[PDB]
Structures are given as C-alpha cells and as structure tokens.
Amino acid sequence: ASKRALVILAKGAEEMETVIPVDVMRRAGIKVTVAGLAGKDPVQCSRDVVICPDASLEDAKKEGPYDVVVLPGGNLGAQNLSESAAVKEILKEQENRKGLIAAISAGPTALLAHEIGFGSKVTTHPLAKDKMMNGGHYTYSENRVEKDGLILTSRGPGTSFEFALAIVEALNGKEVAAQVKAPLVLK
Amino acid sequence: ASKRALVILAKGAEEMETVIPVDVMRRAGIKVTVAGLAGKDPVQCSRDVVICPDASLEDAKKEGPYDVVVLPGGNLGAQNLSESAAVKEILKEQENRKGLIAAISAGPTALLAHEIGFGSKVTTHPLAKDKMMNGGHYTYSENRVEKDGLILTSRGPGTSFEFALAIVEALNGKEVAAQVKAPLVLK
Ligand SMILES: [Cl-]
Ligand SMILES: [Cl-]
16 A cells, blocks of 8 residues: 655745655655645745645644655744644654654754654754754754654755655665656756 | 746646746746746646746746746646747747746757757756657757757756756856855755
8 A cells, every 4th residue: 555645834835845755755656645734725935936735734634644744844834833733743643653754954843843753863954953953852963864763854955855765765665766766867 | 137037837847847946046036937838827747746826927928038938847848838839939039039048857848849949959858868859950968957059958856956056057157056055955
C-alpha cells in the first residue's frame, strides 16, 4: 500500500520548500495531502506564490495518521505552524506512534514550539539556528540533511531536493529514491 | 527601475520549474508576473500542485514588454505553450526587441514550435533533446544552463536554481545573483 504524506501549508511558507517535497514525493508514488493550516482557501507563500491546498488541515487530520508529517519552512510559515494547537496535536500523535517527522529551514522551530523530539540532532537554516537552539533542547548539525530518532531536518531552498529524497528513502527505500533522482537532473 | 519578468503558466507545467524561478527572481527584486495561459483561474501543474496566477496572460501581455519571458517546462505544459498563438506573439515580440527569453526542461520545445532563436545553442531536459533537435535548427548543449544570443536554457528541476540565478545575473548583474544565492543554502 502506498505511503502517505501530510504537508502542512501555512501563510508565509517558503513555496520552494513546499513544492519541491510535494512534487518529488509524488514522483515516488507517495500519496501527498497538501493541507491548509487556515482552511481550504489558497495560501499566500513567502514570495507571493499562491498555492491552493488539497484540503483543510481540519479535514486532513481526520484522515490520519500519515507515514510522514512535513513542515516546510519560511520564517512566517513556521511561526504560524508554531502557534497552531492543531499542528501540536498532529505532531504529538506522530511522535507517539514513532512516525517520521520532517522539517526544513525554519520549519524545525515548530518542533521546538511543540516540544517534539527533544534530545535529537537537528539542522535548520543557518539564520534559524539560534531560535532552534534556545534552551539547548536539541543538538545542532550543519549537515545539509540530518536524521536522528524520528526527526528528519534540512536547511533551506537549496537543500530541498536532498530533504525530499531523504523522505523518499525513509518511506520507499533507497532504490526508489535513486530512480526518482535521475530524471531531476540534479548535480 | 526594477526589471520585470513574465512567467507563462500552463496546465501541466513542472511546478518546481515554475516556483523556483519565480521565488528566486523575487528575491532579486525583479517584479514577476505569473500569467495564466488559459485565463485567471488556478492552474493544475504536472504533479498536481495548484498555483493561482497573478493575472491572465491576456491581461499580462498588455502590460509588456518584459525584461525576460520565462517558459517553465513539464511536457504537457510545454505542449500547451507550443500550441498558443498568444505565446507565439509574445515570444516574437521579445525576440524582435532583443529581450531575454528563458526556457527550462521541455520549455525550449516551445521555442522550436514558434520558430524562435534558430541557430542558437540550447540545452533541454535529456528526454526532450530529440524533440528540440527535430530539423537541426538549434545546436545542442549538455551544459546545465546554456546561453546563446537571446536564448537562456536549462535542463530540469535539479537545474532550476542555476537557471533562475542565470536570469538574475543577466538582468541585475553578478553581484546581485551572488547575494541572492547565499541564503538559499545551495551546494
Ligand atoms: Cl523566509
Ligand atoms: Cl514532465
């Protein structure tokens, strides 16, 4: 049976960090739900790309659980994720069931907000390091993609392919990830 | 005065190849119009990401000319671009005024359809080479980004950052492109 991903899309999300993992996951045959934090309406991302979600988060969360919960970054997107009690419950549920949780750039700061995966090695965008590290609850990594325990993290738009393909490797295995990689014309 | 980009968005467009250049161009302070080929309504891209355009192409073309006309790829997106008389006229106008024309993956095959920039060195997605080369009207390149005459081309999702930053260098110069690059966390 196909693996399922939930991608939580908030106003101010980094659109590249949203679209790259959605697209690459779908290339891997993962069933991806782009879920609007605020409802079903279109979401204005950080650089003004407007994306129509597949479903509201309210609805999508009723179709859980998912094999991965994905948090794109963008500073204001991550702030919105961090403020959401719905996100908090989704992430706590995922952690409790030992499911993959994946977050990129500023997205990992929502893990901090919701007290998820403390004691894990994490990376973030370099500009989000100090936020993420407030309290010393995680160990920092400068790896382009990091994985420790349940928590898969990555740094920025420029690491989004590596992040997505890591998610694919975790869910569908290394061979699938390599087959999806080739037609992308990555370096 | 700010440079202006027109990005033509057709059903079946590769969403990564649309969003990466839009986002990176806006980071460079370029004023970008995402123009819907079919009108103002949301566009279903190749991997089912749904993007709401800024304007219809019909409207956006009245606000020309632009410093760059950008054609994302995706096989079916490029086919739709190739069939459009509106695209044909936009591209012919741009060529006539010696403006930059930029196309990625399958997107360059619309240049072939519309007889634009014959005799230029071009690259495409490897799977779009034979289409592009039908007739021998261009010279093929395996460079990740290629530029010859008016025509800037690139290969795939994985070359989209390099493509976008080439557009930025052409419009706003190398220093701007380097400053936009750093916060992306590219390899
Ligand atoms: Cl940001
Ligand atoms: Cl395609």
